[PDB]
């Protein structure tokens, strides 16, 4: 009951329950759709013509559903049907994935060790930064060699060259984290006097705020149930109805030209296949509007860091804030009518040609 | 197997093991592998005046059971009677 | 290093009008040198440097021809590091011009310099252990 | 939705009926409790009078309809055992129960490629229909609306795996004790849950019928009295025991003097009134403590009496013997965590999953009629929630690690209340941590309090071998621990009586020389003990019998043990001292209750003997020290020693890691074998200690010198390979051979000679002496004292470094390393032994 939670913040549930995926998936969908509605209304656009202005659409795992929905949107009259499609898909993937791999209480010994090692609460998704994919993969394989098949960990989100996310059991990810801590240097280790080759690699691993291990073998049994549930509470995305390219999370291919069911492919992208965000980021665009959650901590700044120096400006459409560096936009840049609204990110190959 | 026959067999086997123990090499590699990997021993207690076997078990763990320990989150607490009496007795210092 | 580059960036920020020539040089450069790689600090700090137009980026520490300097001129040196192109504003040639006719280096010292075969970038760090490429690292006062 | 809850009417001109309808039922059909009241207009002040006749029967009938799904029949003996219907554990049921109690442990949640366990609290769900049937009989009369659940407890029997999804569990309830107290009637029910015939666990449940009851003829009480220990010091004690009729012995001539008797009695009392028992019976087995600390039945307590004011047996045992408390408190409690739980807004989720449809937990009107502060929640829910917290925190979210859990419901708990539970580790019981908890409500009022027996983490006990002996070993434990005192004193007394020396004194003072004197009858007996000591060796099929202490004869007035620096470093005294201080440390641990029942154990060298005497109690302290002292003294004659007492044998500690990274266990074994074979002398690896980081090689001092030299050479440098290694061996051997026989092994860059060792034990050299040593070990280790349960799965022998198992594969493994005729006979005749 979200209306009551919004009207009375006092009796809202706790953050862990809200973060649980059967809540988080549909509610992150609502947040993204609300950002889209605010943008379109304040610009005086119908969702269809705003989509037509958009060169393309895509999403990080969950946001792909919203991307396809706003891709299919036509007008305010039929905008709620696409909202219903997106919200139903998100609700069902959340419910079925939670059923497939619910959240259990981790050993408080593990929790205390993680906390005293300047680490957050263990979660089914662990983000690792400043490590190459091959290095993260060898660590994952070393951990998987000992773990059994049902408790394996695999890379879920290839956010960037030096940014990855490994999904699996929280306990298995804590074991991987123990190995990484064994292989990790202190942050405050002054290595300026050591040769670059001889320097011990340093990286940062932190558990994401997630409640289920997305893009893992663990949520695979949920996929068929989600597909059948969509066919029952009919939510189908048709290539003909979609009128802008939607870039796949796995291979970056447009979802329109896919022979198979777009809804089924989306579900596999969220639950089974990993997200190769760089491989999706091959589209040629000058401006990227990030409607996701997190604001400054959301997908927009990550995409900006990936695409920095290529002449692509990212605008965080969901937050009103000032970026001191002015290397990425905010909600005001979308609605600004002066030359301030039109900000082109530097392209090093051109500007410093 | 009847209980009495089982006892007789076990007594003969134990006698023979003890009899050949002083004439045959000590396979403490296999013993450590058995009680660290097959049983996943979480706490080792070493009954001795010095932490000899405790240091040996520690060495086996750093040399061999490191990725195993990390992956399966086995808190291998190696305690020796001579120095880790507080840990063995559950008498933490207030 | 990174801290020094950040300090240069702070100076440029404090004086956004005055031109600052950031003469980056990796550890592989001749004479006094650091332990830092010639490339990764630049891959890390290039965007911050270009956020200030009054900074001019000059690359040194291991350049002695136009063939090996053109990739840094166009910025395509970063494409092999999987970064966007990273054009550089200038270059400096310290060890190349040591055997030039107008330097006061003695003829035998010039012959000794020319005898140094040199090594690629990836194996310059061996100078800390052995005379790699005819050149070795030593500690000053 | 809205459904009828009460119907008030008149059945006749006088009977007012209040049908209190519970709509929450097993089959969904409403069940009406009719409460009848006489209406007397003549008595205008109080016209309405409760109809007591059949009131308790009606309440019981309605509760039976709600709880039990069998035809209503209250006429059955409370003594008779109640058999509950066979119940099948399902994933859905475990799912619902876990999410109703708040059990988030991963053990109970379905996971891929892993069997789903059921919570310990699920036992009450399995056995409610019998445990609650216990309190129904008309003989145990009482108002069920006034029932109070005083306490509930779970106890897994040892060796029983936790409940798992799919197993079929049978429940057998018995009324342990029903007693009329002034404030009400206590009824204690014990429900045994069994699986595949074997028992799984026991569920105790105490119920209180508040009211006044005088039907003592139907009251009885069975109590397992605490175990009592009595040391028989004098013949007065024996006379007092024999004067007791109840004290009966199978062997009337059994020698009770200097013996410890343990009494495990159970008292069954039937009451005549509140104070006086109508009949008192006290029955149990009396057992004696053997030298191996093993209690074996030698008699029985059998007391029977009619009207009596008490049980004289328990009074006598309390006054004379001492109570053995299995639980052992720590020096100070150890707080674990203070946790906040919340009682649910409704009790239907727990009621429908546990089967407890008590209306006081779901219906406002029934609670009002029961005078409760509100729709109070299941105490069993609170117990399940606290046990979830305990297995999460005390047990680190390991279901199997929780073996016992008792809880007392001191106060009622209302829904939507914050319960603060402080968990403390207060003691140990048979190697299980005893955890107290005290759950209080928001008003700082205790509402739950109980115990939890949580198994320790998987424990192994590794007993150290010779090498670390030092003066003052185990003496602080000898000062403090009483069990260590007893072990050391038994050892010292045996050594004084037999060989006339004090192992305690040797450990404390480390004398360089020790003179045993053979004056008087005691000295002559000690001299005979010394002369009887022989070293028997079957060499080349001939049983040589060398004599240890060849000096000692009938005319020897004294013998003197010599040492260079101290006698505690001599194998004769080093091994018994080490074995004794190990056994004393373990015995103090056992007295403190820190030994898990399932703990495994191994021992390096003598360490094995100490581990056997410690965990398995195969041999007593006396036999242990006898065997170990005999072995240590046979070492003195096992190797030909020169006139200076030094032999040409020893040991070195090789480190394959410090010679070269290439050097592995296989490489070192290859080099050692080639050294021995090519040079002709004896050398071999005796202790495989650490992988490529610590090994021991025993053999000739000269040969070990060549091994050290060759490994030094391999450190200094990097069929045909065999010939090259042979050349290195030849160089080292021709360099070392010319040295005098009593040479000193030099420290290599990787070889560390071991000081104080002059015999190559654990080597092929002492194979001829195994059989006579085996016979001596048989004389010392009695078959009856070997406990297969204590040894199997826990003992890892050094010969066969696998868990001890009496199996044909294990016996064949014994031959695979060392062939022996009895083993081959056993394997050949195995089909005969199994039958
Ligand atoms: C002989 C010699 C003297 C140098 N003296 C200085 C100096 O005095 N101050 C300084 O900042 N760098 C000095 N350098 C470093 C160079 O100026 C330049 O920064 C870079 O390291 C040269 O790189 P390269 O040898 O690969 O061409 C010297 C280099 C050489 C070879």
Q: Which residues contact A38 (CB under 8 A, 6 or more apart)?
A: none
Q: Which residues contact D467 (CB under 8 A, 6 or more apart)?
A: B52, D754, D756
B42 touches chain D (CB under 8 A): yes
**Phi (first) and psi of residue B78, to 5 degrees:** -90, 115
* 3-state percent helix, strand, coil for chain B, nearest multiple of 5: 55, 10, 35
C35 touches chain A (CB under 8 A): yes
What was the structure determination method? cryo-EM
Residue A107 with chain D: CB contacts under 8 Å = 392, 396-398
CB-CB neighbours of C7 under 10 Å: 11
The C-alpha atoms of residue D299 and residue D252 are separated, in whole angstroms, by 9
- If residue D723 lies in a helix (H) or strand (E), which one and from where to where? helix D720-737
Q: Which residues contact D835 (CB under 8 A, 6 or more apart)?
A: none
Rounded alpha-carbon distances, angstroms, from residue D98 to D104, D121, D447, D466: 7, 9, 22, 52
C-alpha D641, offset from chain centre: 47
Q: Put the strands of the sheet holding D683-690 in their side by side order.
A: D683-690, D694-700, D649-654, D752-753
D437: tokens are 């908890």
C127 C-beta closer than 6 A to ligand 1: no
CB neighbour class for A320 (10 Å; exposed up to 12, middle 13-18, buried from 19): exposed
**Phi (first) and psi of residue C123, to 5 degrees:** -125, 30
C-alpha B89, offset from chain centre: 18
In order, the DSSP letters of A84-118 are HHHHHHHHHHHHHHHHHS---BPPHHHHHHHHHTT
CB-CB neighbours of D376 under 10 Å: 20
The C-alpha atoms of residue A126 and residue A144 are separated, in whole angstroms, by 15
CB neighbour class for D504 (10 Å; exposed up to 12, middle 13-18, buried from 19): buried
Contacts of residues D11-19 at CB distance under 8 Å and 24 or more positions apart, as own/partner, are D11/D36, D14/D38, D14/D39, D14/D40, D15/D39, D15/D51, D16/D48
Report the relative pairing of strands D432-440 and D534-539 from DSSP bridges.
unpaired
The C-alpha atoms of residue D134 and residue D124 are separated, in whole angstroms, by 14
Rounded alpha-carbon distances, angstroms, from residue D287 to A293, D232, D593, D700: 73, 13, 21, 53
Q: Which residues contact C53 (CB under 8 A, 6 or more apart)?
A: none
SS3 D513: coil
Contact D142, D207 (CB under 8 A): no
In order, the DSSP letters of A183-231 are T---TT---TTS-TTTSPP--EEEE-S-SS-TTSGGGTTHHHHHHHHHH
- CB contact under 8 Å between A108 and D114, yes or no, is no
In order, the DSSP letters of chain C are -HHHHHHHHHHHHHSSSS-EEEEE--TTSSSS--SS-SSHHHHHHHHHHHTSTTEEEEE-SS--SSTTTHHHHHTGGGGGGTS-----SEE--SSGGGG-TTS---HHHHHHHHH-----GGGGGGGGTS-BTTB------
Pick from B61, B67, B71 the residue to mutate for testing the A interface (most A CBs within 10 Å).
B71
The C-alpha atoms of residue D226 and residue A334 are separated, in whole angstroms, by 81
- Nearest of D706, D766, D700 to residue D735 by alpha carbon: D706
- What is the chain B residue with the closest CA to A180? B70
**Residue reference for tokens 């708040």:** D102
Rounded alpha-carbon distances, angstroms, from residue D88 to D97, D202, D400: 14, 18, 20
Distance A352 CA to ligand 1 centre (A): 26
Would you tell me which residues 56-95 of chain C have a C-beta closer than 8 angstroms to some C-beta of chain A? 74-75, 82-87, 89
Rounded alpha-carbon distances, angstroms, from residue D679 to D670, D721, D738: 14, 17, 14
- If residue D610 lies in a helix (H) or strand (E), which one and from where to where? helix D606-611
Report the relative pairing of strands B43-47 and A329-330 from DSSP bridges.
unpaired
Burial D769-799 (b: 16+ CB within 10 A, else e): bbbbbbebbbebbbbebbbbebbbebbbbbb
> Which among A161, A192, A351 has CB closest to C82?
A161
The C-alpha atoms of residue D203 and residue D699 are separated, in whole angstroms, by 61
Classify residue D768 as left (phi > 0), alpha (psi -120 to 50) or beta: alpha
- Please report the sign of the dihedral spanned by the C-alpha atoms of residue A283, residue A289, residue A291, residue A294: positive
C29 C-beta closer than 6 A to ligand 1: yes
Burial D686-715 (b: 16+ CB within 10 A, else e): bbbbbbbbbbbbbbbbbbbbbbbbbbbebe
C25 C-beta closer than 6 A to ligand 1: yes
Residue B64 with chain D: CB contacts under 8 Å = 691
Distance A202 CA to ligand 1 centre (A): 30
- Nearest of D103, D84, D147 to residue D378 by alpha carbon: D147
C78 C-beta closer than 6 A to ligand 1: no
Radius of gyration of chain D (CA): 36
The C-alpha atoms of residue C83 and residue A307 are separated, in whole angstroms, by 9
Q: Which residues contact D531 (CB under 8 A, 6 or more apart)?
A: D547, D549, D552, D553
The one-character DSSP state at D747 is P
Contact D426, D350 (CB under 8 A): no
The one-character DSSP state at B75 is -
- If residue D619 lies in a helix (H) or strand (E), which one and from where to where? none
Query: Beta partners for D49?
Result: D38
A186 touches chain D (CB under 8 A): no
C32 C-beta closer than 6 A to ligand 1: yes
Contact D117, D108 (CB under 8 A): yes
Query: Beta partners for D515?
Result: D560
A148 touches chain D (CB under 8 A): yes
Distance C50 CA to ligand 1 centre (A): 25
D749: tokens are 């860059």
Residue A106 with chain D: CB contacts under 8 Å = 397
- If residue D796 lies in a helix (H) or strand (E), which one and from where to where? none
SS3 D369: helix
SS3 A135: helix
Contact D814, B13 (CB under 8 A): yes
- Maximum pairwise Cα distance, chain C: 48
Contact D390, D452 (CB under 8 A): yes
Contact D254, D242 (CB under 8 A): no
* 3-state percent helix, strand, coil for chain D, nearest multiple of 5: 35, 30, 35
Task: Point out the ligand 1 atom lying closest to the alpha carbon of residue C93.
Answer: 27
Radius of gyration of chain B (CA): 17
List the resolution, Å. 2.6
A172 touches chain B (CB under 8 A): yes
Instruction: Indicate the Cα dihedral angle A188, A193, A197, A202, nearest 10°.
Output: 0
In order, the DSSP letters of D525-571 are HHHHHHHH-EEEEEETTEEEEEESSTT--TT--EEEE--SS-GGGSH
In order, the DSSP letters of D156-215 are EPTTPPPPBTT-EEEEEEEEEEEEEETTEEEEEEEEEEEETTEEEEEEEEEEEEES----
CB neighbour class for D381 (10 Å; exposed up to 12, middle 13-18, buried from 19): buried
Contact D625, D301 (CB under 8 A): no
- CB contact under 8 Å between B70 and A182, yes or no, is yes
Q: Do chains C and B touch (3 or more CB pairs under 8 A)?
A: no
Distance C39 CA to ligand 1 centre (A): 18
Count of alpha carbons within 13 Å of D333, Cβ hemisphere only? Answer: 12
- CB contact under 8 Å between A348 and C36, yes or no, is no
Apex CA A205: angle with CA A202 and CA A208, to 5°? 160
Q: Which residues contact D651 (CB under 8 A, 6 or more apart)?
A: D686, D696, D697, D698, D704, D753, D754, D757, D760
């Amino acid at each position: 009951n979200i209306l009551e939670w919004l009207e009375n913040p006092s009796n809202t549930p706790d953050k862990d329950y809200l973060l649980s995926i059967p809540i988080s998936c549909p509610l992150i969908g609502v947040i993204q759709l609300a950002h889209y509605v605010v943008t379109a209304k304040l610009l005086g656009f119908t969702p269809g013509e705003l989509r037509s202005y958009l060169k393309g659409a895509t999403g990080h795992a969950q946001g792909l559903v919203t991307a396809v929905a706003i891709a299919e949107t036509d007008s305010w009259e039929s905008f709620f049907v696409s909202v219903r499609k997106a919200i139903t898909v998100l609700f069902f993937i959340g419910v079925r994935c939670y059923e497939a791999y619910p959240n259990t209480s981790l050993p408080p010994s593990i929790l205390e060790d993680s906390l005293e090692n300047n680490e957050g609460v263990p979660s089914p998704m662990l983000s690792i930064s400043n490590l190459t994919q091959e290095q993260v993969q060898d660590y994952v394989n070393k951990t998987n060699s000992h773990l059994p098949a049902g408790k394996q960990v695999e890379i879920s989100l290839v956010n960037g060259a030096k940014n990855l996310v490994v999904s699996g059991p929280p306990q298995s990810l804590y074991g991987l984290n123990l190995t990484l801590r064994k292989a990790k240097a202190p942050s405050g280790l002054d290595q300026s006097r050591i040769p670059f080759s001889e320097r011990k690699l340093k990286f940062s691993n932190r558990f994401l705020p997630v409640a289920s291990p997305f893009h893992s073998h663990l949520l695979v049994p949920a996929s068929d149930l989600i597909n059948k549930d969509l066919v029952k509470n009919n939510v189908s995305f048709n290539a003909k109805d979609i009128q802008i390219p939607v870039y796949d999370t796995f291979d970056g291919s447009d979802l329109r030209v896919l022979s198979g069911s777009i809804s089924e492919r989306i579900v596999d992208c969220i639950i089974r296949l990993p997200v190769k965000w760089e491989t999706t980021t091959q589209f040629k665009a000058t401006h990227i509007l990030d409607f996701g959650p997190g604001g400054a901590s959301g997908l927009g700044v990550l995409t900006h860091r990936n695409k920095d120096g290529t002449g692509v400006r990212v605008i965080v459409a969901g937050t009103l804030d000032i970026n001191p560096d002015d290397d990425y936009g905010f909600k005001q840049e979308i609605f600004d009518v002066t030359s301030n609204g039109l900000k082109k990110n530097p392209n090093w190959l051109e500007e410093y040609h | 197997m009847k209980p009495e026959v089982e006892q007789e067999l076990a007594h003969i086997l134990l006698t023979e093991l003890l009899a050949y123990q002083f004439a045959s090499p000590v396979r403490w590699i296999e013993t450590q592998d058995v009680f660290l990997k097959d049983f996943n021993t979480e706490r080792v207690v070493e009954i001795g005046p010095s932490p000899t076997l405790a240091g040996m078990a520690q060495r086996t763990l750093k040399n061999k059971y490191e990725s195993y320990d990390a992956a399966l989150s086995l808190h291998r607490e190696i305690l020796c009677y001579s120095k880790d009496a507080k840990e063995i007795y559950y008498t933490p210092d207030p | 290093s990174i801290d020094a580059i950040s300090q240069v960036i702070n100076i440029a920020k404090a004086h956004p009008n005055f031109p600052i020539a950031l003469q980056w040089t990796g550890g592989r450069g001749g004479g006094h040198h650091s332990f830092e790689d010639a490339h990764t600090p630049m891959l890390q700090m290039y965007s911050k440097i270009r956020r200030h137009p009054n900074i001019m980026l000059i690359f040194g520490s291991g350049f002695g021809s136009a063939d090996d300097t053109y990739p840094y001129l166009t910025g395509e040196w970063s494409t092999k590091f999987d970064y966007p192109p990273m054009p550089f504003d200038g270059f400096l040639f310290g060890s190349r011009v040591m055997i030039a006719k107008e330097v006061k280096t003695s003829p035998d010292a010039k012959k000794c310099i020319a005898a140094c075969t040199g090594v690629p970038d990836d194996k310059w760090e061996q100078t800390y252990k052995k005379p790699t490429g005819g050149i070795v690292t030593v500690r000053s006062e | 939705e809205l459904k009828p809850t009460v119907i008030l009417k008149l059945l006749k001109e006088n009977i007012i009926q209040m049908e209190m309808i519970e709509n929450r039922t097993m089959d969904g059909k409403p069940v009406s409790l009719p409460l009848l009241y006489n209406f007397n207009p003549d008595n205008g002040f109080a016209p309405i009078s409760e109809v007591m006749e059949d009131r308790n029967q009606r309440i019981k009938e309605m509760y039976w309809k709600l709880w039990i799904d069998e035809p209503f029949n209250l006429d059955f003996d409370p003594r008779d055992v109640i058999k509950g219907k066979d119940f099948e554990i399902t994933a859905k049921e475990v799912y619902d129960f876990t999410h109703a109690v708040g059990n988030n442990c991963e053990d109970f949640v379905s996971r891929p490629d892993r069997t789903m366990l059921a919570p310990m609290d699920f036992a009450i769900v399995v056995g409610w229909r019998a445990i609650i049937k216990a309190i129904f009989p008309n003989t145990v009369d009482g108002d069920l609306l006034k029932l109070v659940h005083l306490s509930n407890g779970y106890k897994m029997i040892p060796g029983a795996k936790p409940l798992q999804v799919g197993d079929v569990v049978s429940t057998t309830a018995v009324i342990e004790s029903v007693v009329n107290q002034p404030t009400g009637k206590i009824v204690d029910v014990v429900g045994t849950l069994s699986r595949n015939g074997k028992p799984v666990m026991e569920v105790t449940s105490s119920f209180f019928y508040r009211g006044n009851y005088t039907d003592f003829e139907n009251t009885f009480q069975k109590t397992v009295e605490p175990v009592y220990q009595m040391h028989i010091k004098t013949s007065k004690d024996i006379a007092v025991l024999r004067s007791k009729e109840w004290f009966q012995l199978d062997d009337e001539d059994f020698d009770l003097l200097n013996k410890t008797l343990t009494f495990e009695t159970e008292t069954e009392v039937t009451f005549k009134n509140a104070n006086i028992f109508s009949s008192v019976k006290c029955f149990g087995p009396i057992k004696v403590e053997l030298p191996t600390k093993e209690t074996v039945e030698i008699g029985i307590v059998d007391y029977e009496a009619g009207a009596s004011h008490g049980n004289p047996v328990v009074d006598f045992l309390k006054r004379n013997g001492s109570t053995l408390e299995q639980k052992v408190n720590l020096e100070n409690p150890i707080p674990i965590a203070v946790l906040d739980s919340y009682t649910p807004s409704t009790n239907e989720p727990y009621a429908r999953v546990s089967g407890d449809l008590n209306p006081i937990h779901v219906s406002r009107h029934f609670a009002s009629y029961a005078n409760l502060p509100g729709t109070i929640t299941h105490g069993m829910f609170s117990s399940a929630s606290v046990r979830a917290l305990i297995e999460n925190w005390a047990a680190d979210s390991v279901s199997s690690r929780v073996r016992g859990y008792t809880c007392q419901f001191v106060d009622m708990v209302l829904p939507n209340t914050a319960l603060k539970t402080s968990i403390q580790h207060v003691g140990m019981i048979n190697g299980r941590k005893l955890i107290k908890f005290e759950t209080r409500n928001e008003d700082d009022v205790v509402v739950l309090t109980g115990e939890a027996e949580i198994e320790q983490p998987v424990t192994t006990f590794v007993f150290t071998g010779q090498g670390s002996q030092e003066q003052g070993m185990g003496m602080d434990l000898y000062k403090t621990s009483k069990a260590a005192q007893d072990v050391w004193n038994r050892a010292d007394n045996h050594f004084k009586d037999t060989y006339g020396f004090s192992i305690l004194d040797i450990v404390i003072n480390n004398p360089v020389n020790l003179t045993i004197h053979f004056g008087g009858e005691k000295g002559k007996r000690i001299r005979e003990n010394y002369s009887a000591m022989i070293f028997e060796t079957i060499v080349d099929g001939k049983l040589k019998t060398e004599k240890i202490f060849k000096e000692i004869n009938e005319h020897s007035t004294s013998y003197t043990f010599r040492s260079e620096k101290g006698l505690l470093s001599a194998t004769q005294f080093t091994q018994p001292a080490l074995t004794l201080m190990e056994k004393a440390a373990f015995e103090d641990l056992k007295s403190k209750g820190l030994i898990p029942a399932d703990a495994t154990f191994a021992g390096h060298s003598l360490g094995e003997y100490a581990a056997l005497a410690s965990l398995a109690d195969v041999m007593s302290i006396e036999s242990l020290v006898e065997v170990v002292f005999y072995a240590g003294m046979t070492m003195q004659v096992a190797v030909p020693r020169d006139e200076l007492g030094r032999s040409n044998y020893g040991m070195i500690a090789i480190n394959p890691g410090r010679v070269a990274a290439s050097f592995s266990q296989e490489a070192l074994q290859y080099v050692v074998e080639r050294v021995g074979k090519r040079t002709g002398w004896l050398v071999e690896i005796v202790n495989y200690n650490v992988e490529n980081q610590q090994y021991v090689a025993a053999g000739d001092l000269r040969a070990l010198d060549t091994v050290t030299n060759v490994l030094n050479f391999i450190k200094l440098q990097k069929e045909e390979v065999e010939g090259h290694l042979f050349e290195i061996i030849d160089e080292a051997s021709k360099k070392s051979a010319v040295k005098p026989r009593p040479l000193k092994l030099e420290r290599g860059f990787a070889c560390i000679p071991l000081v104080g060792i002059s015999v190559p034990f654990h080597s092929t050299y002492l194979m001829n002496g195994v059989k006579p040593f085996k016979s001596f070990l048989k004389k010392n280790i009695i078959k009856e004292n070997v406990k297969v349960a204590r040894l199997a799965g826990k003992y890892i022998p050094n010969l066969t470094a696998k868990p001890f198992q009496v199996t044909k594969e294990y016996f064949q493994d014994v031959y695979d390393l060392t062939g022996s005729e009895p083993i081959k006979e056993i394997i050949d005749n195995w089909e005969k032994y199994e039958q």
